[PDB]
Write a protein that binds this ligand. Structure first.
Ligand SMILES: [Cl-]
Ligand SMILES: [Cl-]
Ligand SMILES: [Cl-]
Length: 100
């Protein structure tokens, strides 16, 4: 199954999400992560910066936030409304795991 946690890192603000994403899928690993803002139709790629993933906007981000994952093995998962607009530095958001 795919298990994930998202921890909001210091440096995040209304225009910037810095996320420690811990992605667990046996024998696989994360390749891509994208954000879809609430009321938006486009997926915006997060940039991997070492231990964390980042997405910035020129305007405040609109949540709750949805995330699309693509594993190296080509497994797709979408986790919906995982982080609220009014997210909190240092808090972890942990959606239900997704069994294949
Ligand atoms: Cl499973
Ligand atoms: Cl919160
Ligand atoms: Cl799976």
């Amino acid at each position: 199954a795919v298990q994930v946690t998202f921890t909001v890192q210091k440096g995040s603000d209304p225009k910037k999400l810095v996320l420690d994403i811990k992605y667990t899928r046996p024998g696989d690993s994360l390749a891509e992560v994208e954000l879809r803002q609430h009321g938006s139709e486009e997926w915006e790629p997060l940039t991997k910066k070492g231990n964390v993933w980042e997405v910035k906007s020129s305007k405040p981000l609109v949540g709750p936030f949805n995330f699309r994952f693509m594993s190296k093995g080509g497994m797709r998962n979408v986790f919906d409304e995982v982080i609220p607009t009014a997210f909190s530095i240092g808090k972890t958001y942990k959606p239900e795991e997704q069994e294949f």
